[PDB]
Amino acid sequence: LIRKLPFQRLVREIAQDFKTDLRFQSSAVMALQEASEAYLVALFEDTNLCAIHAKRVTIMPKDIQLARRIRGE
Amino acid sequence: RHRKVLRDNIQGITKPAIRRLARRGGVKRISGLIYEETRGVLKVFLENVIRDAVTYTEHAKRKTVTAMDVVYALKRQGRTL
Amino acid sequence: GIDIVINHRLLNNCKENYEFLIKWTDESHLHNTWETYESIGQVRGLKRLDNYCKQFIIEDQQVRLDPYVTAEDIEIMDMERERRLDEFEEFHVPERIIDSQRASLEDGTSQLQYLVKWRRLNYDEATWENATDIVKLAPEQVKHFQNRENSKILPQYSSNYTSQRPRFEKLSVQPPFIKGGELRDFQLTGINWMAFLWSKGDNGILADEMGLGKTVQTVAFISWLIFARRQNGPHIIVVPLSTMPAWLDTFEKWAPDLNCICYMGNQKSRDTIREYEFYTNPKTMKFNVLLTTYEYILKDRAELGSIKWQFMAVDEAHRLKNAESSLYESLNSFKVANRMLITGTPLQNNIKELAALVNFLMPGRFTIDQEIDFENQDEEQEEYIHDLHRRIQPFILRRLKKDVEKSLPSKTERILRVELSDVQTEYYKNILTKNYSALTAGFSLLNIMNELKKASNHPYLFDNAEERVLQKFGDGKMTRENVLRGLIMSSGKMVLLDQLLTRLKKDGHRVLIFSQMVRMLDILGDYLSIKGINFQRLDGTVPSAQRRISIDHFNSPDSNDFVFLLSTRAGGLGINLMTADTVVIFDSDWNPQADLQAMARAHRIGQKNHVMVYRLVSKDTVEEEVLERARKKMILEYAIIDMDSIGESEVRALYKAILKFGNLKEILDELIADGTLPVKSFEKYGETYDEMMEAAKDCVHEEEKNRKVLFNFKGVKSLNAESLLSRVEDLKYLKNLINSNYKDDPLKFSLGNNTPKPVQNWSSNWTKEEDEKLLIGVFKYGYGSWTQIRDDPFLGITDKIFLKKVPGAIHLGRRVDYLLSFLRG
DNA sequence: AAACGCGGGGGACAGCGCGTACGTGCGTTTAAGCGGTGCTAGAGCTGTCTACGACCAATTGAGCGGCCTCGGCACCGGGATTCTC
DNA sequence: GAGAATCCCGGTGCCGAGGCCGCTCAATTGGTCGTAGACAGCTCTAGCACCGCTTAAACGCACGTACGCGCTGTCCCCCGCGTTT
Numbered sequence A: 001l002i003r004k005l006p007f008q009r010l011v012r013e014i015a016q017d018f019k020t021d022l023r024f025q026s027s028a029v030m031a032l033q034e035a036s037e038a039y040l041v042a043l044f045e046d047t048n049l050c051a052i053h054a055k056r057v058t059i060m061p062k063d064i065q066l067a068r069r070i071r072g073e
Numbered sequence B: 001r002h003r004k005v006l007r008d009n010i011q012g013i014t015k016p017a018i019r020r021l022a023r024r025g026g027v028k029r030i031s032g033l034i035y036e037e038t039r040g041v042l043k044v045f046l047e048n049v050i051r052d053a054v055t056y057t058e059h060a061k062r063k064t065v066t067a068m069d070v071v072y073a074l075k076r077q078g079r080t081l
Numbered sequence C: 001g002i003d004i005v006i007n008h009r010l011l012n013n014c015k016e017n018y019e020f021l022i023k024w025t026d027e028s029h030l031h032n033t034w035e036t037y038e039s040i041g042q043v044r045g046l047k048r049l050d051n052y053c054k055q056f057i058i059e060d061q062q063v064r065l066d067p068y069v070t071a072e073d074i075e076i077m078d079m080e081r082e083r084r085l086d087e088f089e090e091f092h093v094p095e096r097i098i099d100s101q102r103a104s105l106e107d108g109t110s111q112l113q114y115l116v117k118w119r120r121l122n123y124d125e126a127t128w129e130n131a132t133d134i135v136k137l138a139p140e141q142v143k144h145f146q147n148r149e150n151s152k153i154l155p156q157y158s159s160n161y162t163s164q165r166p167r168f169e170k171l172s173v174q175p176p177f178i179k180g181g182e183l184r185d186f187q188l189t190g191i192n193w194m195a196f197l198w199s200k201g202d203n204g205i206l207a208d209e210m211g212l213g214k215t216v217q218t219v220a221f222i223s224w225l226i227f228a229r230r231q232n233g234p235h236i237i238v239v240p241l242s243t244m245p246a247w248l249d250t251f252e253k254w255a256p257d258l259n260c261i262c263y264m265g266n267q268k269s270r271d272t273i274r275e276y277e278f279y280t281n282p283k284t285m286k287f288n289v290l291l292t293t294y295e296y297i298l299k300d301r302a303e304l305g306s307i308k309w310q311f312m313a314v315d316e317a318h319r320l321k322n323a324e325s326s327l328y329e330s331l332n333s334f335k336v337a338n339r340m341l342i343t344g345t346p347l348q349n350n351i352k353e354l355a356a357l358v359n360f361l362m363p364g365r366f367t368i369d370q371e372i373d374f375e376n377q378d379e380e381q382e383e384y385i386h387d388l389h390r391r392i393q394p395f396i397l398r399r400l401k402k403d404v405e406k407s408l409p410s411k412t413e414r415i416l417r418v419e420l421s422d423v424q425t426e427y428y429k430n431i432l433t434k435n436y437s438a439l440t441a442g443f444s445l446l447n448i449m450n451e452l453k454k455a456s457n458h459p460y461l462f463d464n465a466e467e468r469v470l471q472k473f474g475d476g477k478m479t480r481e482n483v484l485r486g487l488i489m490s491s492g493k494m495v496l497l498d499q500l501l502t503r504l505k506k507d508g509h510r511v512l513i514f515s516q517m518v519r520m521l522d523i524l525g526d527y528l529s530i531k532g533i534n535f536q537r538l539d540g541t542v543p544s545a546q547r548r549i550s551i552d553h554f555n556s557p558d559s560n561d562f563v564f565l566l567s568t569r570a571g572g573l574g575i576n577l578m579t580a581d582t583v584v585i586f587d588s589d590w591n592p593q594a595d596l597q598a599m600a601r602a603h604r605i606g607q608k609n610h611v612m613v614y615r616l617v618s619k620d621t622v623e624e625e626v627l628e629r630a631r632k633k634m635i636l637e638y639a640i641i642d643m644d645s646i647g648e649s650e651v652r653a654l655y656k657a658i659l660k661f662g663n664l665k666e667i668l669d670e671l672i673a674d675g676t677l678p679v680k681s682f683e684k685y686g687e688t689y690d691e692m693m694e695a696a697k698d699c700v701h702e703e704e705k706n707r708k709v710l711f712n713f714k715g716v717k718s719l720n721a722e723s724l725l726s727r728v729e730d731l732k733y734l735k736n737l738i739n740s741n742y743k744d745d746p747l748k749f750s751l752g753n754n755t756p757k758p759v760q761n762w763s764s765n766w767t768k769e770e771d772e773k774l775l776i777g778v779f780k781y782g783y784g785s786w787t788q789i790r791d792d793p794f795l796g797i798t799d800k801i802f803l804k805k806v807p808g809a810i811h812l813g814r815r816v817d818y819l820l821s822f823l824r825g
Numbered sequence D: 001a002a003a004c005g006c007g008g009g010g011g012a013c014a015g016c017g018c019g020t021a022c023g024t025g026c027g028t029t030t031a032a033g034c035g036g037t038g039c040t041a042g043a044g045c046t047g048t049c050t051a052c053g054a055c056c057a058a059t060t061g062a063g064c065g066g067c068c069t070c071g072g073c074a075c076c077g078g079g080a081t082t083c084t085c
Numbered sequence E: 001g002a003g004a005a006t007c008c009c010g011g012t013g014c015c016g017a018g019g020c021c022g023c024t025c026a027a028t029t030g031g032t033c034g035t036a037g038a039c040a041g042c043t044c045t046a047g048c049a050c051c052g053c054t055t056a057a058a059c060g061c062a063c064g065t066a067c068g069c070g071c072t073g074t075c076c077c078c079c080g081c082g083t084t085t
């Protein structure tokens, strides 16, 4: 659901700050994709509960902050 | 002209993709503020998992990150999650 | 609906004053009309007009207002206006009638129509149009069209030779099939070699040196096999995109009779081609030839593999380097009787690649059959390479232009070594020293070789280096002068290039630039622009149409643009640049054959002065070792170097034929070849025709005996005397007189002083003119061809005659009987 | 200390109105996806040799357990200060 | 501004902490033996970067409606306080 090349660029850019000039297996990038998608989808399914609890229809960032607090991060 | 080159990486996650994810997450409507907010969260998640993955690969004196190292990072993250 | 608006003629100033030219979304390009805002009112698409209005406003305001805008910018604006107008006019010109249709309307009226493709559009955005208009717009095109479905050159009637190929003997001269010009002697010899090989059934390659005519040779070979052998099955040619226009043009020049299709473009376009062009009334195929590109192979192999192709070829075989190529796999999924590979150079970087190629030609036991690589120098490599040479030499046709064609001027190959600039030197040293700190303000060091390779030619490929020079001129960076100065001095090899280019500008040379890197080519093009030079680019960024017109323009003999600037990958292959005489290779590929191709694009047949090639190399850089890698690859060439029977169905077909055409024995070969008659001895059909003519005369004598109508042939009752005898003599008389005066053109015909009686109260008005046109129709198509007679639009009949409206086939027959009796009286 | 009863105040709940933001559609532009080009580095494998760890025995010192003594913390009471109505 | 609650100060009581002493067990020292790991070399997979070509996704702007937010009014419940269990 997220474009492969942009995500691979981003993950490489982030990795750069721990140590330069890492190479990556493509399967590792796919694993990162699947993990990140799963995490985001879960976080949305969670925060939607907070949104409907506040009797909203929209998601608002207050709700993300709340969710991240309650699950603990 | 050549000057049309530009760079910004984090925007590679963009509103249509975030929309798709939210719709998969059953969301009805979203404020625009969410787009930058979720990007922050996503960076932190990446930040943590990469830190583990690289630390595996450097302990093995590798130059290449493998899917095995990644999945061991996830097996730590999800249980610590 | 509003389609793109074309032009404007005399925001609120625009809306009040101007009228625009509106194309319509559901209508032909010729249906476009001038409209104002108040004329159009409000309708789907109006924002596009507003967007065009904004464009015109920015066009107007920048033209009028700004003293910072030069007269030259106004010239460029006029050049854009004309460049758009040229295409938008030529879109009126038809190029292919696709199909004929009959339409009936709630008016209570019927019309004939053509599906027509415009001269620069795909088959998507083809449209129906009224037949009796397009016939007067493009009578050449409609006649050329209707010849095709009138033709008998078809897979339906291609003669198979599944038992064995027929006899072949070397053809002494250009066969009369071939019309575009004169074959060269060596070209004819190549055709002979291909014919010889095909008569042995073998697949092969043509590898005569680049530009020696391979397109003409191949199309001629097709023409020979299709006409002489009657190998009229579906044939397929796979083509690198940039050359597709010239191929089609070559087809049109050398063998226009062969109907061919450019299966290309958007999905809907291809779908319409599959709908209307491929199949006879869904199957069997209405076309001789496909041209296509590898993209559409990989996409539509699902469809195209369905066809039982007779013959297949590829213009550039080297693209198939290895058996695992998805193209190689998918093409091997095709079913075809023979294959033919064309190349500039078969001997790519590894003998393994040639082994895969010949495996493509032949089953694996034909191949090298031993995968040991070519030794750099040893005994075993010598015996093995000479073994392979002796195996393969029969299957290669190759010739060198130096040997073949001493008329063409030679080439000089020269290399120029240039010292790095300061910025080049420091960047190079910094990447050599892995200096992440230095490159932080310069960075993906994961390919050191690539990074320093692109550094070595030019520093502005690193995104600060421009600012890193301009900021020490932080005001002058606004000036054209200091921008140019900094750019040119950035890179010593550019300083050299500019000096040489200036000398060639003085001396009136015409020059090609090649590079691998699109960013570099962009920088160099911007250099030309700020120097004010006239040039065109070509690479992957330009779709087919704009590149096609750019090549055409630069080939135009007036063309002011003296520089053309190309990628090696897209621009290296098959482009024709014999208006150029000079080449600069700004950098080289790892593969020498790419450089040979790029050179050869200038060194075509028809180039008429000696060409200079300069290769520019950064001295004391890795690329002069890449040159040694190229030489090491180059080394390889120096190593390898019933008929008596008649069936009742045939009796029927003959009887109908002679009822339409009289003494068929003139036409009769065509009547077999078009399948009207099953294949039998021509002599048998002749004698049985004469026999029944005599039997008809006898029947007339029996009528005379009776007074003073069916009769059988070989018991077949499907015959009568009087209709045949009268029809034969009448049609002979008509065709004789029409030839005798008119034959130069029967459209000249008129019945003249013979004044016929009118039609009796038909549902359609009729005159001597309608009679005359009908007679010309019956001459073109014979008696009783009533569908074709009515359909032919040059007769103007197509409205006037019906499929309970009064005149029909019986009335037409009686009218013809009267008209011919009166004229014969 | 918990349970039970009583009154008053505050919060929660609901409805309404208005404005802004979000969604949708259209048109245009750009980048991604797929295939191919080319090369080198790094992984992955194999073999050999050496040093380190494990095992065993003896010896010695420290740590653990018990006991005793003293100090610090908690609790209680009174007076002063702060916060709330 | 007054009343109640909280805080601070001083003394007493005791229990826990801290230290000392003795004995036993664990750690330390030394020697021997085996193998795992380290080091070196070789082979070839696969990753990195870029081009070509196509098509849809993205991106931008405009328009309209729905939802969110704020305000007002009413009713319920819970909190607080006192008494009894």
Ligand SMILES: Nc1ncnc2c1ncn2[C@@H]1O[C@H](COP(=O)(O)OP(=O)(O)O)[C@@H](O)[C@H]1O
Pocket: C181, C182, C183, C184, C187, C209, C210, C211, C212, C213, C214, C215, C216, C574, C576, C604, C605, C606
């Ligand atoms: N028989 C011929 N007579 C004259 N000119 C020819 C002939 N064959 C080819 N040419 C010239 O060669 C050019 C086409 O090059 P071509 O041989 O098609 O390239 P390639 O075959 O290498 O792809 C044309 O411009 C044409 O002038």
Ligand code: BEF
Pocket: C209, C210, C211, C212, C343, C344, C573, C574, C575, C600, C601, C604
């Ligand atoms: F090789 Be040819 F000139 F295309």
Ligand SMILES: [Mg+2]
Pocket: C243, C315, C316, C342, C574
């Ligand atoms: Mg070619």
